[PDB]
């Protein structure tokens, strides 16, 4: 069942509007779910129209021809999550693909910190250095590593957590993987962030 | 096969009506409680509407006074549950449950008084 | 209250079976429906199976036709997933909920009372990759200090951070963990705090890596 806007980025207060294909020619009433990030989804909206109990009133449902709608009459930052429809054909259940619902924002800057590998860590051979991207916005961001100047390929990866549930910001860590032999034949480390107009840059020296 | 069969239910928009009908086999005579129960998504199924089939007492159901009415046509076996003035609120699968064995009209309308069910008809209130 | 609890997911090699439990309490067991759905990791909902026992209805999405067997115990209130031939593509958090007894009869297009109560889901991972437990390396900190808890190389997920053993909510970001070339996993979690405190206020990382029974406290002291 394809819903419509499979994605979706809209700012605090806005109204927002899903919608869902019946699949099969035999119409069947649509439920609607919220779930967060790996999390069990939750009821929202059964029987088309019907609000489940508890939910709050900003969220509603309805036909448009013959298909089906989801609104948030007020989007609001705990909303942001993948909505999905539901329907019955004859003893089968199916959803649909999902709908992603990201809040839409100002700007924020990260505090950027780096880290050494620890101690620990080296003993054996390996060396992690990490760079934390903290409370940023939007979360589209080059993180570039630099060693004694020099850029690095295919030994990073990043990982952002989902949105704050009350200020909307992402925070991202990029883990730089060196073996123990390379780092110390090295001395300064550094990562950069790039965001349209500003790259900020941490760095530590290996004699700290 | 004693067994019980709902029919009627549709959507409805709010202050609409709708009437709901049960229809038992086996041999009737013998039931003593006729009641309509309802249960929606994530809520307990409630008593709504008890009939006493010998003396034909009703016993209703604080959120329904006044606007839900069951009825008995012992022509037929069948009971009745005329809903009016419907409102969001009232969207459930309404269901129709019998028992034999007397228990005092204080339990008319509870779950457990009763032996057998429908399967149910679903009603649907909404704008 | 209601609630379904789930268990029995873990990892198994391809081809392998397992058989997952939904422990339904709060509510007569007969009067409802229990369904599996189950989500591969980034992806959506796939429903997949349900019972009604006291009617022992069953049905079965196409996708595991064959290979997977729903059944209950109204005795104990349980419904399990029998999963055989498992593959890669079984690989999925598997959630179970509760639906109507009788809602394939009920289902219309003015009614569908959807499912309201779910489970927390239970991952299983289908892989030949065996079980190795995490490594945890402090993130060691420097107005307001930042520090953390690197934890890698293991397997299989999930592996859930804590700090100061729960008294310590706020600031805390975990990272989702990532697959390294290796095969294995890794994730860090960090927290800011005031730089007026890493003097006074002691600060223990809490590791628990359930799929190798292991957990790993680890403290976070500043480098000098």
């Known amino acids: 069942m394809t819903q419509s806007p499979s994605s979706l980025s809209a700012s605090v207060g806005d109204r927002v509007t899903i919608t869902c294909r019946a699949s099969q020619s035999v119409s069947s009433a649509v439920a609607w779910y919220q779930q967060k990030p790996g999390k069990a989804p939750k009821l929202l909206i059964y029987?088309?129209?019907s609000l489940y109990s508890g939910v709050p009133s900003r969220f509603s449902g309805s036909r448009s021809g013959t298909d089906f709608t989801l609104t948030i009459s007020s989007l609001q930052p705990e909303d942001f999550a993948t909505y999905y429809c539901?329907?019955?054909?004859?003893?089968?259940?199916?959803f649909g693909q999902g709908t992603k619902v990201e809040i839409k924002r100002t700007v924020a800057a990260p505090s950027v910190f780096i880290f050494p590998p620890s101690d620990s860590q080296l003993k054996s051979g390996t060396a992690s250095v990490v760079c934390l991207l903290n409370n940023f916005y939007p979360r589209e961001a080059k993180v570039q590593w630099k060693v004694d100047n020099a850029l690095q390929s295919g030994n990073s990866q990043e990982s952002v957590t989902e949105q704050d549930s009350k200020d909307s910001t992402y925070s991202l860590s990029s883990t730089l993987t060196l073996s123990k032999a390379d780092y110390e034949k090295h001395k300064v480390y550094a990562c950069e962030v790039t965001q349209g107009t500003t790259s900020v840059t941490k760095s530590f020296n290996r004699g700290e | 096969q004693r067994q019980l069969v709902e029919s009627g239910g549709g959507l409805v928009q709010p202050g609409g009506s709708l009437r709901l009908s049960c229809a038992a086999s086996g041999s009737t005579d013998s039931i003593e409680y006729m009641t309509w129960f309802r249960q929606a998504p994530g809520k307990e199924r409630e008593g709504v509407a008890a009939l006493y089939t010998h003396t034909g007492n009703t016993y209703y159901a604080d959120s329904v006074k006044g606007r839900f009415i069951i009825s008995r046509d012992k022509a037929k076996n069948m009971v009745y549950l005329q809903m009016n003035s419907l409102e969001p609120e009232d969207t459930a699968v309404y269901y129709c449950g019998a028992t034999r064995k007397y228990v005092p009209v204080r339990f008319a309308l509870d779950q457990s008084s009763y032996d057998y069910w429908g399967k149910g008809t679903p009603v649907t209130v909404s704008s | 209250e209601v609630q379904l609890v789930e268990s029995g997911g873990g990892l198994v090699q391809p081809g392998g079976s397992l058989r997952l439990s939904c422990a339904a309490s709060?509510?007569?067991?007969?009067?409802?429906?229990i369904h599996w759905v189950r989500q591969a990791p980034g992806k959506g909902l796939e429903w997949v199976a349900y019972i009604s026992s006291s009617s022992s209805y069953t049905s079965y999405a196409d996708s595991v036709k064959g290979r997977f067997t729903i059944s209950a115990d109204t005795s104990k209130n349980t419904a399990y997933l029998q999963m055989n031939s498992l593959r890669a593509e079984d690989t999925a958090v598997y959630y179970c909920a509760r639906g109507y007894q009788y809602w394939q009869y009920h289902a219309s297009w003015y009614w569908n009372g959807g499912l309201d109560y779910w489970g927390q889901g239970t991952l299983v991972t289908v892989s030949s990759a065996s079980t190795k437990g995490p490594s945890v390396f402090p993130l060691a900190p420097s107005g307001t200090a930042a520090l953390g808890c690197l934890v890698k190389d293991y397997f299989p997920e999930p592996v859930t951070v804590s700090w100061n053993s729960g008294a310590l909510t706020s600031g805390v970001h975990t990272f989702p963990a990532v697959l390294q070339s290796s095969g294995l996993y890794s994730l860090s979690s960090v927290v800011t705090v005031p730089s007026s405190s890493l003097g006074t206020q002691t600060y223990i990382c809490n590791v628990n890596h359930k799929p190798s029974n292991t957990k790993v406290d680890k403290k976070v002291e500043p480098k000098s």
């Open positions: 709060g509510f007569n067991f007969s009067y409802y429906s």
């Open positions: 539901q329907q019955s054909s004859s003893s089968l259940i199916t």
């Open positions: 029987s088309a129209s």
